[PDB]
Structures are given as C-alpha cells and as structure tokens.
Amino acid sequence: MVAPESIVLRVARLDELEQVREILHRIYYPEEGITISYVHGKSHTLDDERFSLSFVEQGTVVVAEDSAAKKFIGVSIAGPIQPGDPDAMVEEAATTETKKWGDILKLLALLERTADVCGRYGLEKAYHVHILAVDPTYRGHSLGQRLLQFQMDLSKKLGFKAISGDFTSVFSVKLAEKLGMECISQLALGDYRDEKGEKLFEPLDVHQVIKTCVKLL
C-alpha cells in the first residue's frame, strides 16, 4: 500500500532518539522471543530499553522509513563485540535495575561466549546485530533483508571482518542464511538454566531455538 521507492533505509541520527524508542516499543519488544518468553513478565524494562538506545549515538542504528508518511517502519540495532564482553555483561547483571534485564544479559552472555565468533575466526572484534524488526503492516517490501544487508554493507565499510546475530525466530534464521550467514551455535530457549538452575524462559514453539549465525565480511 506504499510506493516502494518511498522506502528509505538510513542510519538514525542522535536527534531521532525518541522515534527509535517509539519503533522499538511498537514493533520490536512485543514480538521478541526472549523478551516475551520470560516467566515473570513479558513486557520489556527501562534498562533493556536504555541498552538498545545506547547505540543511536554510536551510528549503528539503521532505520527503514516511509518518507511519504514520515514514519519509521523498520529498525536494526548493532554494535561491536569482543573477547571479555560476556564477563562484563554478567557483571552488569549483578547491579542492573531489573532482575529481568539481568537475567536476559546473562542469557545473551552465554550465547556470545558459546558462539565465540572472535575466537573461532581470529578476530579482535566483530559486529553483532542485537535487534532486527519490521512493521508487519509493511510486509512485501523485503524490509528484513534490506535492513540486514544494510548492516552488512555498513559494518564492512567501517572495517569489521565479521557480522553476527542471535536469531530467535524460524523466520529470522531463514533470512540470515539467505544472506549467507552460517549458524554456528544454538540453544533451546526452554532448556536454558541460569546459575541457580532456574528455568526463566518458556517459549512458544516459534521461538523454541535461538541460533547465532555469522558471516565473514
């Protein structure tokens, strides 16, 4: 229902912080398998949001915009990862505002440690897509692929040698593979236990497996 060249992909500017916040609220957090599988509340927290938004000033937040409608219709958030990150995430978890964000941090740390992208390929760091979300209303415009391809092209231009992500739905994994990413590690979300032996995520079968997938750039 929209002219296809009315769709613009670009880096979000710092001054657009609030519109990034808005798209994350509307189309990302309500559908993210990790977030919504959590057994003590499905909504996201402020410390989760603060993390996502910290990347806007770094210039690695990519938006899809309907320029006619002057509206964000897609978003992807990425950042560097490097050895040492998982331990630092666990440390932040001990002091963060919510138990939920602390619990998710520890999950993400496990995903990152297990994947070991930097170790596996001999890198000092890699580019990791934290978030990839598309407004369902704008299906049929290949937005997911375009957002991911944009992050690939961008990180390559910034001198990163690998891009990764944790792909938490069967669709997002298929997209990743389509663009040449190989899934090198995985985790059954239902089977994840923290260091207290507790089961903190209870997913629908659509979000049953999380695959970390990587592509050399």
mmCIF file with all atom_site columns, all heavy atoms in Angstrom, residues 6-29:
data_model
loop_
_atom_site.group_PDB
_atom_site.id
_atom_site.type_symbol
_atom_site.label_atom_id
_atom_site.label_alt_id
_atom_site.label_comp_id
_atom_site.label_asym_id
_atom_site.label_entity_id
_atom_site.label_seq_id
_atom_site.pdbx_PDB_ins_code
_atom_site.Cartn_x
_atom_site.Cartn_y
_atom_site.Cartn_z
_atom_site.occupancy
_atom_site.B_iso_or_equiv
_atom_site.pdbx_formal_charge
_atom_site.auth_seq_id
_atom_site.auth_comp_id
_atom_site.auth_asym_id
_atom_site.auth_atom_id
_atom_site.pdbx_PDB_model_num
ATOM 1   N N   . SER A 1 6  ? 9.385  4.934  -1.941 1.00 0.00 ? 6  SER A N   1
ATOM 2   C CA  . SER A 1 6  ? 9.062  5.778  -0.801 1.00 0.00 ? 6  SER A CA  1
ATOM 3   C C   . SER A 1 6  ? 9.721  5.199  0.458  1.00 0.00 ? 6  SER A C   1
ATOM 4   O O   . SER A 1 6  ? 9.684  5.812  1.523  1.00 0.00 ? 6  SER A O   1
ATOM 5   C CB  . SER A 1 6  ? 7.545  5.865  -0.611 1.00 0.00 ? 6  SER A CB  1
ATOM 6   O OG  . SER A 1 6  ? 7.198  6.836  0.359  1.00 0.00 ? 6  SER A OG  1
ATOM 7   N N   . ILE A 1 7  ? 10.306 4.009  0.333  1.00 0.00 ? 7  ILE A N   1
ATOM 8   C CA  . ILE A 1 7  ? 11.001 3.379  1.454  1.00 0.00 ? 7  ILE A CA  1
ATOM 9   C C   . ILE A 1 7  ? 12.463 3.791  1.458  1.00 0.00 ? 7  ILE A C   1
ATOM 10  O O   . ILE A 1 7  ? 13.174 3.561  0.489  1.00 0.00 ? 7  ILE A O   1
ATOM 11  C CB  . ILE A 1 7  ? 10.965 1.837  1.388  1.00 0.00 ? 7  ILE A CB  1
ATOM 12  C CG1 . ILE A 1 7  ? 9.531  1.310  1.217  1.00 0.00 ? 7  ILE A CG1 1
ATOM 13  C CG2 . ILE A 1 7  ? 11.629 1.253  2.629  1.00 0.00 ? 7  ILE A CG2 1
ATOM 14  C CD1 . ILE A 1 7  ? 8.597  1.637  2.359  1.00 0.00 ? 7  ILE A CD1 1
ATOM 15  N N   . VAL A 1 8  ? 12.908 4.371  2.567  1.00 0.00 ? 8  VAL A N   1
ATOM 16  C CA  . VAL A 1 8  ? 14.292 4.812  2.712  1.00 0.00 ? 8  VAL A CA  1
ATOM 17  C C   . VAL A 1 8  ? 14.959 4.045  3.855  1.00 0.00 ? 8  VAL A C   1
ATOM 18  O O   . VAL A 1 8  ? 14.385 3.938  4.931  1.00 0.00 ? 8  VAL A O   1
ATOM 19  C CB  . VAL A 1 8  ? 14.340 6.313  3.056  1.00 0.00 ? 8  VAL A CB  1
ATOM 20  C CG1 . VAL A 1 8  ? 15.765 6.766  3.304  1.00 0.00 ? 8  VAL A CG1 1
ATOM 21  C CG2 . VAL A 1 8  ? 13.690 7.124  1.943  1.00 0.00 ? 8  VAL A CG2 1
ATOM 22  N N   . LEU A 1 9  ? 16.150 3.512  3.608  1.00 0.00 ? 9  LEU A N   1
ATOM 23  C CA  . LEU A 1 9  ? 16.991 2.943  4.676  1.00 0.00 ? 9  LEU A CA  1
ATOM 24  C C   . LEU A 1 9  ? 18.180 3.847  4.968  1.00 0.00 ? 9  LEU A C   1
ATOM 25  O O   . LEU A 1 9  ? 18.878 4.287  4.044  1.00 0.00 ? 9  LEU A O   1
ATOM 26  C CB  . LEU A 1 9  ? 17.513 1.567  4.279  1.00 0.00 ? 9  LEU A CB  1
ATOM 27  C CG  . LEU A 1 9  ? 16.518 0.451  4.575  1.00 0.00 ? 9  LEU A CG  1
ATOM 28  C CD1 . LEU A 1 9  ? 15.461 0.383  3.482  1.00 0.00 ? 9  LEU A CD1 1
ATOM 29  C CD2 . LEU A 1 9  ? 17.271 -0.858 4.722  1.00 0.00 ? 9  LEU A CD2 1
ATOM 30  N N   . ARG A 1 10 ? 18.412 4.130  6.241  1.00 0.00 ? 10 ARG A N   1
ATOM 31  C CA  . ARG A 1 10 ? 19.489 5.022  6.619  1.00 0.00 ? 10 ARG A CA  1
ATOM 32  C C   . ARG A 1 10 ? 19.821 4.865  8.084  1.00 0.00 ? 10 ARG A C   1
ATOM 33  O O   . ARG A 1 10 ? 19.044 4.293  8.850  1.00 0.00 ? 10 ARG A O   1
ATOM 34  C CB  . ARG A 1 10 ? 19.097 6.484  6.343  1.00 0.00 ? 10 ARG A CB  1
ATOM 35  C CG  . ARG A 1 10 ? 17.837 6.930  7.083  1.00 0.00 ? 10 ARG A CG  1
ATOM 36  C CD  . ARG A 1 10 ? 17.452 8.346  6.737  1.00 0.00 ? 10 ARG A CD  1
ATOM 37  N NE  . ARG A 1 10 ? 16.255 8.810  7.436  1.00 0.00 ? 10 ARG A NE  1
ATOM 38  C CZ  . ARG A 1 10 ? 16.227 9.241  8.686  1.00 0.00 ? 10 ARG A CZ  1
ATOM 39  N NH1 . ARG A 1 10 ? 17.325 9.255  9.420  1.00 0.00 ? 10 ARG A NH1 1
ATOM 40  N NH2 . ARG A 1 10 ? 15.085 9.657  9.209  1.00 0.00 ? 10 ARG A NH2 1
ATOM 41  N N   . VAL A 1 11 ? 20.976 5.392  8.469  1.00 0.00 ? 11 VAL A N   1
ATOM 42  C CA  . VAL A 1 11 ? 21.357 5.450  9.871  1.00 0.00 ? 11 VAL A CA  1
ATOM 43  C C   . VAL A 1 11 ? 20.493 6.478  10.597 1.00 0.00 ? 11 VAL A C   1
ATOM 44  O O   . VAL A 1 11 ? 20.266 7.601  10.100 1.00 0.00 ? 11 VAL A O   1
ATOM 45  C CB  . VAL A 1 11 ? 22.838 5.810  10.022 1.00 0.00 ? 11 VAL A CB  1
ATOM 46  C CG1 . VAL A 1 11 ? 23.181 6.163  11.469 1.00 0.00 ? 11 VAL A CG1 1
ATOM 47  C CG2 . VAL A 1 11 ? 23.687 4.658  9.537  1.00 0.00 ? 11 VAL A CG2 1
ATOM 48  N N   . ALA A 1 12 ? 20.006 6.094  11.771 1.00 0.00 ? 12 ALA A N   1
ATOM 49  C CA  . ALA A 1 12 ? 19.282 7.022  12.646 1.00 0.00 ? 12 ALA A CA  1
ATOM 50  C C   . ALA A 1 12 ? 20.217 8.050  13.249 1.00 0.00 ? 12 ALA A C   1
ATOM 51  O O   . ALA A 1 12 ? 21.318 7.726  13.702 1.00 0.00 ? 12 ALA A O   1
ATOM 52  C CB  . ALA A 1 12 ? 18.556 6.265  13.753 1.00 0.00 ? 12 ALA A CB  1
ATOM 53  N N   . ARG A 1 13 ? 19.769 9.301  13.250 1.00 0.00 ? 13 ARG A N   1
ATOM 54  C CA  . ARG A 1 13 ? 20.536 10.382 13.840 1.00 0.00 ? 13 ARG A CA  1
ATOM 55  C C   . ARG A 1 13 ? 20.258 10.443 15.345 1.00 0.00 ? 13 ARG A C   1
ATOM 56  O O   . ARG A 1 13 ? 19.175 10.052 15.813 1.00 0.00 ? 13 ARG A O   1
ATOM 57  C CB  . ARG A 1 13 ? 20.145 11.712 13.191 1.00 0.00 ? 13 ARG A CB  1
ATOM 58  C CG  . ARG A 1 13 ? 20.351 11.768 11.680 1.00 0.00 ? 13 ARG A CG  1
ATOM 59  C CD  . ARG A 1 13 ? 20.197 13.199 11.186 1.00 0.00 ? 13 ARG A CD  1
ATOM 60  N NE  . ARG A 1 13 ? 19.014 13.808 11.789 1.00 0.00 ? 13 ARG A NE  1
ATOM 61  C CZ  . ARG A 1 13 ? 17.788 13.724 11.287 1.00 0.00 ? 13 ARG A CZ  1
ATOM 62  N NH1 . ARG A 1 13 ? 17.567 13.084 10.148 1.00 0.00 ? 13 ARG A NH1 1
ATOM 63  N NH2 . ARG A 1 13 ? 16.774 14.296 11.926 1.00 0.00 ? 13 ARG A NH2 1
ATOM 64  N N   . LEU A 1 14 ? 21.227 10.948 16.093 1.00 0.00 ? 14 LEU A N   1
ATOM 65  C CA  . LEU A 1 14 ? 21.078 11.108 17.533 1.00 0.00 ? 14 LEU A CA  1
ATOM 66  C C   . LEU A 1 14 ? 19.786 11.831 17.912 1.00 0.00 ? 14 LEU A C   1
ATOM 67  O O   . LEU A 1 14 ? 19.046 11.382 18.790 1.00 0.00 ? 14 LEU A O   1
ATOM 68  C CB  . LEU A 1 14 ? 22.299 11.834 18.098 1.00 0.00 ? 14 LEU A CB  1
ATOM 69  C CG  . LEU A 1 14 ? 22.330 12.046 19.613 1.00 0.00 ? 14 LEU A CG  1
ATOM 70  C CD1 . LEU A 1 14 ? 21.975 10.775 20.372 1.00 0.00 ? 14 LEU A CD1 1
ATOM 71  C CD2 . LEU A 1 14 ? 23.710 12.540 20.010 1.00 0.00 ? 14 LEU A CD2 1
ATOM 72  N N   . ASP A 1 15 ? 19.490 12.927 17.226 1.00 0.00 ? 15 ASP A N   1
ATOM 73  C CA  . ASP A 1 15 ? 18.247 13.683 17.466 1.00 0.00 ? 15 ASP A CA  1
ATOM 74  C C   . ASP A 1 15 ? 16.964 12.889 17.218 1.00 0.00 ? 15 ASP A C   1
ATOM 75  O O   . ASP A 1 15 ? 15.875 13.330 17.580 1.00 0.00 ? 15 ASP A O   1
ATOM 76  C CB  . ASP A 1 15 ? 18.228 14.966 16.617 1.00 0.00 ? 15 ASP A CB  1
ATOM 77  C CG  . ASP A 1 15 ? 18.115 14.693 15.119 1.00 0.00 ? 15 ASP A CG  1
ATOM 78  O OD1 . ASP A 1 15 ? 16.989 14.454 14.646 1.00 0.00 ? 15 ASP A OD1 1
ATOM 79  O OD2 . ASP A 1 15 ? 19.147 14.749 14.409 1.00 0.00 ? 15 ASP A OD2 1
ATOM 80  N N   . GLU A 1 16 ? 17.078 11.718 16.600 1.00 0.00 ? 16 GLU A N   1
ATOM 81  C CA  . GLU A 1 16 ? 15.914 10.874 16.380 1.00 0.00 ? 16 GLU A CA  1
ATOM 82  C C   . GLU A 1 16 ? 15.752 9.789  17.464 1.00 0.00 ? 16 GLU A C   1
ATOM 83  O O   . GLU A 1 16 ? 14.945 8.869  17.310 1.00 0.00 ? 16 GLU A O   1
ATOM 84  C CB  . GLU A 1 16 ? 15.999 10.220 14.994 1.00 0.00 ? 16 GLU A CB  1
ATOM 85  C CG  . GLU A 1 16 ? 16.018 11.226 13.853 1.00 0.00 ? 16 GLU A CG  1
ATOM 86  C CD  . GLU A 1 16 ? 16.098 10.566 12.495 1.00 0.00 ? 16 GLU A CD  1
ATOM 87  O OE1 . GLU A 1 16 ? 17.178 10.030 12.149 1.00 0.00 ? 16 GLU A OE1 1
ATOM 88  O OE2 . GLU A 1 16 ? 15.088 10.602 11.760 1.00 0.00 ? 16 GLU A OE2 1
ATOM 89  N N   . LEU A 1 17 ? 16.527 9.912  18.539 1.00 0.00 ? 17 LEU A N   1
ATOM 90  C CA  . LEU A 1 17 ? 16.461 9.010  19.705 1.00 0.00 ? 17 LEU A CA  1
ATOM 91  C C   . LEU A 1 17 ? 15.024 8.585  20.017 1.00 0.00 ? 17 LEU A C   1
ATOM 92  O O   . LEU A 1 17 ? 14.729 7.396  20.144 1.00 0.00 ? 17 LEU A O   1
ATOM 93  C CB  . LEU A 1 17 ? 17.082 9.717  20.921 1.00 0.00 ? 17 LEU A CB  1
ATOM 94  C CG  . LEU A 1 17 ? 17.451 8.987  22.226 1.00 0.00 ? 17 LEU A CG  1
ATOM 95  C CD1 . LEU A 1 17 ? 16.241 8.321  22.853 1.00 0.00 ? 17 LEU A CD1 1
ATOM 96  C CD2 . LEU A 1 17 ? 18.588 7.991  22.039 1.00 0.00 ? 17 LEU A CD2 1
ATOM 97  N N   . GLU A 1 18 ? 14.118 9.552  20.117 1.00 0.00 ? 18 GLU A N   1
ATOM 98  C CA  . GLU A 1 18 ? 12.766 9.263  20.579 1.00 0.00 ? 18 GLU A CA  1
ATOM 99  C C   . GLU A 1 18 ? 11.950 8.486  19.577 1.00 0.00 ? 18 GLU A C   1
ATOM 100 O O   . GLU A 1 18 ? 11.091 7.701  19.969 1.00 0.00 ? 18 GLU A O   1
ATOM 101 C CB  . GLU A 1 18 ? 12.023 10.545 20.976 1.00 0.00 ? 18 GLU A CB  1
ATOM 102 C CG  . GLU A 1 18 ? 12.554 11.174 22.258 1.00 0.00 ? 18 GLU A CG  1
ATOM 103 C CD  . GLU A 1 18 ? 12.571 10.212 23.441 1.00 0.00 ? 18 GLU A CD  1
ATOM 104 O OE1 . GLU A 1 18 ? 11.645 9.370  23.576 1.00 0.00 ? 18 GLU A OE1 1
ATOM 105 O OE2 . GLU A 1 18 ? 13.522 10.304 24.247 1.00 0.00 ? 18 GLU A OE2 1
ATOM 106 N N   . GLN A 1 19 ? 12.220 8.668  18.286 1.00 0.00 ? 19 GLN A N   1
ATOM 107 C CA  . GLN A 1 19 ? 11.482 7.914  17.277 1.00 0.00 ? 19 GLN A CA  1
ATOM 108 C C   . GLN A 1 19 ? 12.023 6.492  17.191 1.00 0.00 ? 19 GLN A C   1
ATOM 109 O O   . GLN A 1 19 ? 11.283 5.560  16.843 1.00 0.00 ? 19 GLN A O   1
ATOM 110 C CB  . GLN A 1 19 ? 11.545 8.593  15.911 1.00 0.00 ? 19 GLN A CB  1
ATOM 111 C CG  . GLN A 1 19 ? 10.687 9.854  15.824 1.00 0.00 ? 19 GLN A CG  1
ATOM 112 C CD  . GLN A 1 19 ? 11.397 11.092 16.344 1.00 0.00 ? 19 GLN A CD  1
ATOM 113 O OE1 . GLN A 1 19 ? 12.492 11.439 15.886 1.00 0.00 ? 19 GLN A OE1 1
ATOM 114 N NE2 . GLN A 1 19 ? 10.766 11.779 17.292 1.00 0.00 ? 19 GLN A NE2 1
ATOM 115 N N   . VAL A 1 20 ? 13.308 6.333  17.508 1.00 0.00 ? 20 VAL A N   1
ATOM 116 C CA  . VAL A 1 20 ? 13.881 4.988  17.631 1.00 0.00 ? 20 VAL A CA  1
ATOM 117 C C   . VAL A 1 20 ? 13.196 4.294  18.819 1.00 0.00 ? 20 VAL A C   1
ATOM 118 O O   . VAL A 1 20 ? 12.741 3.171  18.702 1.00 0.00 ? 20 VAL A O   1
ATOM 119 C CB  . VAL A 1 20 ? 15.407 4.997  17.843 1.00 0.00 ? 20 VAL A CB  1
ATOM 120 C CG1 . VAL A 1 20 ? 15.906 3.571  18.020 1.00 0.00 ? 20 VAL A CG1 1
ATOM 121 C CG2 . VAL A 1 20 ? 16.134 5.655  16.669 1.00 0.00 ? 20 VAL A CG2 1
ATOM 122 N N   . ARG A 1 21 ? 13.120 4.985  19.961 1.00 0.00 ? 21 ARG A N   1
ATOM 123 C CA  . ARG A 1 21 ? 12.447 4.434  21.143 1.00 0.00 ? 21 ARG A CA  1
ATOM 124 C C   . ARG A 1 21 ? 11.036 3.970  20.767 1.00 0.00 ? 21 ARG A C   1
ATOM 125 O O   . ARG A 1 21 ? 10.605 2.851  21.096 1.00 0.00 ? 21 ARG A O   1
ATOM 126 C CB  . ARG A 1 21 ? 12.400 5.479  22.273 1.00 0.00 ? 21 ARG A CB  1
ATOM 127 C CG  . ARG A 1 21 ? 11.913 4.930  23.614 1.00 0.00 ? 21 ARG A CG  1
ATOM 128 C CD  . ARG A 1 21 ? 11.513 6.022  24.614 1.00 0.00 ? 21 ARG A CD  1
ATOM 129 N NE  . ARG A 1 21 ? 12.553 7.031  24.830 1.00 0.00 ? 21 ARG A NE  1
ATOM 130 C CZ  . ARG A 1 21 ? 13.540 6.946  25.725 1.00 0.00 ? 21 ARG A CZ  1
ATOM 131 N NH1 . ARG A 1 21 ? 13.661 5.882  26.508 1.00 0.00 ? 21 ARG A NH1 1
ATOM 132 N NH2 . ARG A 1 21 ? 14.424 7.934  25.835 1.00 0.00 ? 21 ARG A NH2 1
ATOM 133 N N   . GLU A 1 22 ? 10.337 4.818  20.023 1.00 0.00 ? 22 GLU A N   1
ATOM 134 C CA  . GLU A 1 22 ? 8.952  4.546  19.641 1.00 0.00 ? 22 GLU A CA  1
ATOM 135 C C   . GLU A 1 22 ? 8.811  3.299  18.770 1.00 0.00 ? 22 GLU A C   1
ATOM 136 O O   . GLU A 1 22 ? 7.918  2.478  18.988 1.00 0.00 ? 22 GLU A O   1
ATOM 137 C CB  . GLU A 1 22 ? 8.364  5.771  18.936 1.00 0.00 ? 22 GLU A CB  1
ATOM 138 C CG  . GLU A 1 22 ? 6.848  5.731  18.772 1.00 0.00 ? 22 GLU A CG  1
ATOM 139 C CD  . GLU A 1 22 ? 6.381  4.820  17.642 1.00 0.00 ? 22 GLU A CD  1
ATOM 140 O OE1 . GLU A 1 22 ? 7.069  4.753  16.594 1.00 0.00 ? 22 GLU A OE1 1
ATOM 141 O OE2 . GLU A 1 22 ? 5.316  4.173  17.791 1.00 0.00 ? 22 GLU A OE2 1
ATOM 142 N N   . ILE A 1 23 ? 9.683  3.139  17.773 1.00 0.00 ? 23 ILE A N   1
ATOM 143 C CA  . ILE A 1 23 ? 9.571  1.965  16.909 1.00 0.00 ? 23 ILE A CA  1
ATOM 144 C C   . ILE A 1 23 ? 9.927  0.697  17.690 1.00 0.00 ? 23 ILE A C   1
ATOM 145 O O   . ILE A 1 23 ? 9.316  -0.351 17.496 1.00 0.00 ? 23 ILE A O   1
ATOM 146 C CB  . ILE A 1 23 ? 10.389 2.112  15.587 1.00 0.00 ? 23 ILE A CB  1
ATOM 147 C CG1 . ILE A 1 23 ? 10.072 0.977  14.613 1.00 0.00 ? 23 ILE A CG1 1
ATOM 148 C CG2 . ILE A 1 23 ? 11.880 2.196  15.846 1.00 0.00 ? 23 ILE A CG2 1
ATOM 149 C CD1 . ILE A 1 23 ? 8.651  0.991  14.122 1.00 0.00 ? 23 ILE A CD1 1
ATOM 150 N N   . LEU A 1 24 ? 10.881 0.801  18.608 1.00 0.00 ? 24 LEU A N   1
ATOM 151 C CA  . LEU A 1 24 ? 11.245 -0.364 19.424 1.00 0.00 ? 24 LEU A CA  1
ATOM 152 C C   . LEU A 1 24 ? 10.061 -0.812 20.268 1.00 0.00 ? 24 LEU A C   1
ATOM 153 O O   . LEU A 1 24 ? 9.782  -2.003 20.367 1.00 0.00 ? 24 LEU A O   1
ATOM 154 C CB  . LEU A 1 24 ? 12.445 -0.058 20.314 1.00 0.00 ? 24 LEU A CB  1
ATOM 155 C CG  . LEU A 1 24 ? 13.778 0.067  19.600 1.00 0.00 ? 24 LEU A CG  1
ATOM 156 C CD1 . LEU A 1 24 ? 14.855 0.509  20.597 1.00 0.00 ? 24 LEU A CD1 1
ATOM 157 C CD2 . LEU A 1 24 ? 14.180 -1.227 18.885 1.00 0.00 ? 24 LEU A CD2 1
ATOM 158 N N   . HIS A 1 25 ? 9.369  0.151  20.869 1.00 0.00 ? 25 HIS A N   1
ATOM 159 C CA  . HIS A 1 25 ? 8.145  -0.125 21.647 1.00 0.00 ? 25 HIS A CA  1
ATOM 160 C C   . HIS A 1 25 ? 7.075  -0.821 20.812 1.00 0.00 ? 25 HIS A C   1
ATOM 161 O O   . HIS A 1 25 ? 6.461  -1.795 21.241 1.00 0.00 ? 25 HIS A O   1
ATOM 162 C CB  . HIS A 1 25 ? 7.537  1.192  22.150 1.00 0.00 ? 25 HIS A CB  1
ATOM 163 C CG  . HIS A 1 25 ? 7.899  1.553  23.556 1.00 0.00 ? 25 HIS A CG  1
ATOM 164 N ND1 . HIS A 1 25 ? 9.164  1.965  23.926 1.00 0.00 ? 25 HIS A ND1 1
ATOM 165 C CD2 . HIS A 1 25 ? 7.138  1.624  24.675 1.00 0.00 ? 25 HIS A CD2 1
ATOM 166 C CE1 . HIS A 1 25 ? 9.171  2.254  25.217 1.00 0.00 ? 25 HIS A CE1 1
ATOM 167 N NE2 . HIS A 1 25 ? 7.955  2.055  25.694 1.00 0.00 ? 25 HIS A NE2 1
ATOM 168 N N   . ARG A 1 26 ? 6.857  -0.301 19.616 1.00 0.00 ? 26 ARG A N   1
ATOM 169 C CA  . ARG A 1 26 ? 5.712  -0.701 18.795 1.00 0.00 ? 26 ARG A CA  1
ATOM 170 C C   . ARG A 1 26 ? 5.917  -2.031 18.100 1.00 0.00 ? 26 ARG A C   1
ATOM 171 O O   . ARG A 1 26 ? 5.044  -2.894 18.158 1.00 0.00 ? 26 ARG A O   1
ATOM 172 C CB  . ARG A 1 26 ? 5.408  0.390  17.759 1.00 0.00 ? 26 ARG A CB  1
ATOM 173 C CG  . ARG A 1 26 ? 4.215  0.076  16.865 1.00 0.00 ? 26 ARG A CG  1
ATOM 174 C CD  . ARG A 1 26 ? 3.826  1.240  15.961 1.00 0.00 ? 26 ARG A CD  1
ATOM 175 N NE  . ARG A 1 26 ? 4.391  1.128  14.612 1.00 0.00 ? 26 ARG A NE  1
ATOM 176 C CZ  . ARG A 1 26 ? 5.309  1.942  14.090 1.00 0.00 ? 26 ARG A CZ  1
ATOM 177 N NH1 . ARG A 1 26 ? 5.805  2.959  14.791 1.00 0.00 ? 26 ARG A NH1 1
ATOM 178 N NH2 . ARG A 1 26 ? 5.740  1.738  12.848 1.00 0.00 ? 26 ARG A NH2 1
ATOM 179 N N   . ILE A 1 27 ? 7.062  -2.217 17.446 1.00 0.00 ? 27 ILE A N   1
ATOM 180 C CA  . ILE A 1 27 ? 7.257  -3.422 16.644 1.00 0.00 ? 27 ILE A CA  1
ATOM 181 C C   . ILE A 1 27 ? 8.324  -4.404 17.105 1.00 0.00 ? 27 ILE A C   1
ATOM 182 O O   . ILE A 1 27 ? 8.261  -5.559 16.729 1.00 0.00 ? 27 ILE A O   1
ATOM 183 C CB  . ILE A 1 27 ? 7.499  -3.095 15.152 1.00 0.00 ? 27 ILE A CB  1
ATOM 184 C CG1 . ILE A 1 27 ? 8.814  -2.352 14.967 1.00 0.00 ? 27 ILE A CG1 1
ATOM 185 C CG2 . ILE A 1 27 ? 6.333  -2.279 14.601 1.00 0.00 ? 27 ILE A CG2 1
ATOM 186 C CD1 . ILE A 1 27 ? 9.330  -2.383 13.541 1.00 0.00 ? 27 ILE A CD1 1
ATOM 187 N N   . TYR A 1 28 ? 9.294  -3.990 17.919 1.00 0.00 ? 28 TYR A N   1
ATOM 188 C CA  . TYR A 1 28 ? 10.307 -4.951 18.365 1.00 0.00 ? 28 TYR A CA  1
ATOM 189 C C   . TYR A 1 28 ? 9.907  -5.700 19.659 1.00 0.00 ? 28 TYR A C   1
ATOM 190 O O   . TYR A 1 28 ? 9.640  -6.901 19.640 1.00 0.00 ? 28 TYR A O   1
ATOM 191 C CB  . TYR A 1 28 ? 11.669 -4.277 18.553 1.00 0.00 ? 28 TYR A CB  1
ATOM 192 C CG  . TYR A 1 28 ? 12.701 -5.214 19.136 1.00 0.00 ? 28 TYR A CG  1
ATOM 193 C CD1 . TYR A 1 28 ? 13.084 -6.363 18.456 1.00 0.00 ? 28 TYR A CD1 1
ATOM 194 C CD2 . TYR A 1 28 ? 13.286 -4.963 20.371 1.00 0.00 ? 28 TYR A CD2 1
ATOM 195 C CE1 . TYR A 1 28 ? 14.018 -7.230 18.978 1.00 0.00 ? 28 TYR A CE1 1
ATOM 196 C CE2 . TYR A 1 28 ? 14.222 -5.831 20.904 1.00 0.00 ? 28 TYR A CE2 1
ATOM 197 C CZ  . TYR A 1 28 ? 14.582 -6.956 20.204 1.00 0.00 ? 28 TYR A CZ  1
ATOM 198 O OH  . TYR A 1 28 ? 15.509 -7.817 20.726 1.00 0.00 ? 28 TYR A OH  1
ATOM 199 N N   . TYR A 1 29 ? 9.855  -4.974 20.769 1.00 0.00 ? 29 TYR A N   1
ATOM 200 C CA  . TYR A 1 29 ? 9.682  -5.599 22.086 1.00 0.00 ? 29 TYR A CA  1
ATOM 201 C C   . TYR A 1 29 ? 8.442  -6.509 22.250 1.00 0.00 ? 29 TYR A C   1
ATOM 202 O O   . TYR A 1 29 ? 8.541  -7.559 22.896 1.00 0.00 ? 29 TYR A O   1
ATOM 203 C CB  . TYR A 1 29 ? 9.730  -4.538 23.179 1.00 0.00 ? 29 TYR A CB  1
ATOM 204 C CG  . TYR A 1 29 ? 11.123 -4.051 23.500 1.00 0.00 ? 29 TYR A CG  1
ATOM 205 C CD1 . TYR A 1 29 ? 11.442 -2.706 23.414 1.00 0.00 ? 29 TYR A CD1 1
ATOM 206 C CD2 . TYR A 1 29 ? 12.120 -4.936 23.896 1.00 0.00 ? 29 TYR A CD2 1
ATOM 207 C CE1 . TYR A 1 29 ? 12.713 -2.248 23.723 1.00 0.00 ? 29 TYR A CE1 1
ATOM 208 C CE2 . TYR A 1 29 ? 13.387 -4.492 24.202 1.00 0.00 ? 29 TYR A CE2 1
ATOM 209 C CZ  . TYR A 1 29 ? 13.681 -3.144 24.106 1.00 0.00 ? 29 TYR A CZ  1
ATOM 210 O OH  . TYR A 1 29 ? 14.937 -2.691 24.406 1.00 0.00 ? 29 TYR A OH  1
#
